[PDB]
């Protein structure tokens, strides 16, 4: 949950902050968090399940890091970031839907979807950051 929340929070920060013309210092820490998320997710295969009518979806992460070279973000930078963010938002939304439609009588607080169970592994703890909601 904390990892899934951190992924969504990073994506929301990227959507709100990676905008044309913005100082790189406005986004430096966000870029580092985002690149850490990319590093952690790269090479991991996920499946969001087929319960009910939710389509079975497969997710592969082989993304390059976001650049650090611009003093102000230009349109090319925003477009590359937008592409990566769009894939990640699709993944997070699908994981959230796959978790919401499942329930358990024995341990209903624990993750039920397979992807959220995988994201509970220690390797993904690096993604975890500000939990302010």
């Amino acid at each position: 949950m904390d990892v899934l929340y951190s992924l969504s929070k990073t994506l929301k920060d990227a959507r709100d902050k990676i905008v044309e013309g913005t100082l790189y210092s406005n986004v430096s820490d966000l870029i580092q968090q985002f690149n850490q998320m990319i590093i952690t997710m790269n090479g991991n295969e996920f499946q969001t399940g087929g319960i009910g009518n939710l389509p079975i979806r497969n997710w592969n992460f082989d993304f390059g890091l976001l650049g650090t070279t611009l003093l102000n973000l230009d349109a090319n930078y925003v477009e590359t970031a937008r592409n990566t963010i769009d894939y990640f938002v699709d993944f997070v939304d699908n994981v959230c839907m796959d978790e919401m439609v499942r329930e358990s009588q024995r341990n209903g607080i624990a993750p039920q979807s397979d992807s959220l169970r995988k994201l509970s592994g220690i390797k993904f703890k690096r993604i975890n950051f500000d939990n302010s909601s």
């Binding site: 790189y24 210092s25 650090t68 070279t69 611009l70 003093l71 102000n72």
Partner: protein, 779 residues
């Protein structure tokens, strides 16, 4: 240079060939005796140790088997062709062959022996080789002891040669060289189906010497730097130094009567410095050796060239103090005075570099943007073809960063320098003009550096590790200025032969490193598994480092060697070595029990026990096992020196078994047995509290004994109160010892694959970079 001689003298790996079957046992004739101890007319063949040289003491026996493991690893071949070992069997019906000549000698001795049964002679007469020429296979008869057969069968079934063809030779070239359109490769031989080669072991560093072994890593990076220097191509058709100095003097308007900063701009401009800078940069990035910046702050040309250098080379390649000094000089001599900013008061030890502070403080967009690029220009770590590499930014590789630097420089030239005398602005403008008169050459030079770097990087086999090294390679900024002022339009790329040489040296070093690691790991693991607790392993690591050939072990402390030992001890053993050691572990008890020099122990009972009957001894006071007796371990007794228990047991005549590798006396005297001399040899243990002098009596009573009539004339079965814990030899069964050894009939092994490849370059004027454009483009 002696370092280059050491690194380029390393040979790939000495190929071991087997010339004879490995043998621990041989057949041997022995007299046999009837159940009553009378000698039979017929003899019997028994397996014996070929070299019965086992020591006294269990610890020394385990040491002996570590030495045997080393011997077997020495004798284990890379490949084997049995026809080289094949010799005539003179009694073969078909006049066929056997392996090895030792087998032939055994067969001859058995066949000629009058006591040999005719069935054995028939069997010898049937021993011959079979050739399957279609499959390139041959089978030979051999006579081997089962343990010998296991060792030789393992050698035959685990050879290191693989089929070799033209496709394999071509694929041995790194993929990036083959994918380059600047190189054309050719062959003139069709290698046959019988061609073989041995793959180098290019595993990536399992010791992680780049982590926490800083002296050793400094040595490795120094050797790599020297080799990279040797393979970096020399610059051709540099601008004439005299002509360029004349042109620069005209641009600078040097005045005889005035002391001018611009004069120092000419300092240290010559082709030697330019070539040295080129080599230093490429070699330092190839070896990931930290560079240090040497410059005079009064040379503003040095600072402008330093701006170019920090644009193109990622700044982590520089030691922090020198980078900070260069950046601070650039800020306080060029940038801040240009914009009228107060001189940067920079603190030594600041978390930020001067360029980072200036980027936060500079309101001009082009200058601030170039500063930000420098502040964030880094190597990209990428695994390519299984090798970790440090890749440059694409805008460095196409030379586009030079344009950003030139934009910032043009912005600086346009500034007013409000708080400066006008001649100061004139000096800065003159230095910038010297650099900007060669913008096309600078783009070409950046592209050439990047291309040579990545082409030579394709030849690197070990992971490129980015860690600041203990010592640096000094780079003079005047040399950077020479390279910027003198580089022409002549494109120089590594020769294909140079690339192959560099790649082969890297492969030789990598393979040697892996093979020495495997040897050290096998020895360390075997020594632990043999419980050699008194063995200090420093010698093993010292041998390992010596065989790596690049370190001076006299400079390596014992603590570092033992840290290396700890890291090696965690690695798994290579499969062939592990299987050989498993075979030795499986069979060492049997090999030790075959020795005629030692017994496995002695049972002191205090009751009459009949001597056992065994054809090769007659009557013998041997124990096949220690069942029904308390065991005192002699090795523990010798280690602790505490003799209370053994002294009490001996003084009280308490039956016991003293267990451990012991030498024994052989006594064939019936009178000596009747005198009960075997019971007299233990009192010295109590007298002196030593057991390394213990030597039990092994009675051998038979018709060769002088007083054997007593056995014969009294229906008396000899009895003793002591027994030797010992095994009897196994009979040599000729038919059961025959094995068909199979191998390839014939093949040829090849060492240097790239010798079959002839490679040339396209015309350098038409050599292209990764972006398909010519590397250099100036008229």
């Amino acid at each position: 240079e002696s370092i280059l001689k050491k690194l380029e003298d390393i040979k790939p790996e000495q190929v071991k060939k087997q010339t004879k079957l490995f043998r621990i046992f041989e057949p041997r004739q022995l007299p046999v005796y009837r159940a009553n101890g009378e000698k039979e007319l017929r003899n019997r063949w028994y397996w014996k140790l070929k070299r019965d040289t086992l020591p006294d003491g269990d610890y020394d026996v385990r040491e002996y088997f570590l030495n045997l493991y080393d011997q077997v690893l020495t004798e284990m071949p890379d490949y084997l062709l049995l026809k080289d070992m094949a010799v005539e069997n003179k009694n073969s019906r078909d006049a066929g062959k056997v392996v090895d000549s030792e087998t032939a000698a055994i067969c001859d001795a058995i066949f000629q022996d009058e006591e040999t049964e005719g069935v054995v002679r028939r069997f010898i007469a049937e021993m011959r080789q079979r050739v399957q020429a279609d499959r390139n296979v041959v089978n030979y008869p051999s006579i081997l002891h089962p343990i010998d057969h296991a060792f030789n069968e393992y050698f035959l079934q685990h050879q290191l040669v693989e089929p070799l063809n033209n496709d394999i030779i071509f694929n041995y070239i790194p993929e990036r060289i083959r994918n380059d359109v600047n190189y054309i490769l050719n062959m003139d031989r069709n290698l046959p189906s019988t061609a073989r080669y041995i793959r180098p072991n290019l595993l990536q560093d399992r010791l992680n010497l780049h982590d926490n072994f800083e002296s050793l890593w400094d040595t490795i990076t120094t050797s790599n730097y020297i080799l990279a220097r040797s393979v970096v191509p020399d610059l051709k058709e540099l601008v004439s130094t005299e002509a360029q100095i004349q042109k620069m003097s005209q641009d600078l308007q040097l005045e005889a009567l005035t002391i001018q900063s611009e004069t120092q701009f000419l300092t240290g401009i010559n082709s030697q410095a330019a070539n040295d800078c080129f080599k230093t940069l490429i070699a330092a990035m190839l070896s990931q050796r930290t560079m240090s910046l040497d410059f005079v702050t009064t040379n503003y040309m040095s600072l402008i060239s330093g701006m170019w250098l920090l644009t193109v080379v990622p700044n982590d390649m520089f030691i922090r103090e020198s980078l900070v000094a260069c950046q601070l000089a650039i800020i306080n001599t060029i940038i801040y005075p240009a914009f009228g900013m107060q001189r940067m008061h920079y603190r030594n030890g600041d978390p930020q570099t001067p360029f980072q502070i200036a980027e936060q403080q500079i309101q001009n967009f082009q200058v601030a943007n170039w500063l930000h690029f420098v502040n964030n220009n880094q190597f990209r770590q990428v695994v390519i073809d299984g090798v970790l590499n440090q890749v440059l930014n694409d805008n460095i590789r196409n030379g586009h960063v030079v344009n950003q630097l030139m934009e910032a420089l043009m912005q600086l030239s346009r500034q007013q320098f409000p708080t400066m005398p006008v001649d100061y602005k004139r000096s800065i403008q003159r230095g910038i003009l010297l650099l900007s008169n060669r913008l096309g050459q600078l783009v070409d030079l950046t592209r050439l550096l990047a291309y040579n770097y990545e082409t030579l990087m394709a030849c690197i086999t070990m992971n490129m590790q980015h860690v600041q090294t203990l010592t640096t390679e000094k780079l003079q900024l005047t040399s950077v200025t020479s390279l910027c002022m003198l580089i022409g339009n002549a494109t120089v790329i590594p020769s294909p032969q140079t690339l192959f040489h560099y790649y082969n040296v890297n492969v030789n070093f990598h393979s040697n490193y892996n093979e020495r690691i495997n040897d050290a790991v096998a020895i360390i693991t075997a020594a632990n598994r043999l419980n050699l607790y008194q063995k200090k392993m420093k010698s093993i690591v010292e041998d390992f480092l010596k065989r790596l050939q690049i370190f001076d072990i006299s400079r390596v402390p014992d603590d570092q060697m033992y840290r290396l030992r700890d890291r090696l001890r965690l690695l798994p053993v290579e499969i062939r070595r592990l299987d050989i050691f498993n075979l030795i572990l499986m069979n060492m008890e049997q090999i030790e029990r075959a020795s005629d020099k030692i017994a496995q122990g002695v049972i002191i009972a205090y009751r009459d026990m009949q001597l056992e009957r065994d054809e090769m001894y007659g009557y013998v006071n041997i124990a096949r096992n220690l069942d029904g007796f308390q065991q005192i371990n002699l090795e523990e007794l010798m280690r602790t020196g505490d003799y209370a228990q053994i002294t009490n047991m001996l003084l009280n005549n308490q039956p016991v078994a003293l267990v451990g590798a012991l030498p024994f006396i052989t006594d064939s005297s019936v009178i000596s047995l009747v005198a009960k001399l075997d019971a007299t040899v233990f009192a010295q243990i109590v007298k002196l509290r030593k057991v390394d002098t213990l030597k039990p009596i092994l009675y051998k009573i038979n018709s060769d004994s002088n007083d054997f009539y007593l056995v014969a004339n009294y229906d008396w079965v000899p009895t003793s109160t002591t027994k030797v814990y010992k095994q009897i030899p196994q009979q040599f069964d000729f038919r059961a010892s025959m094995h068909m050894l199979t191998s390839n009939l014939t093949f040829t092994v090849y060492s240097d694959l790239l010798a079959f490849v002839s490679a040339d370059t396209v015309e350098p004027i038409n050599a292209v970079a990764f972006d398909n454009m010519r590397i250099m483009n100036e008229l």
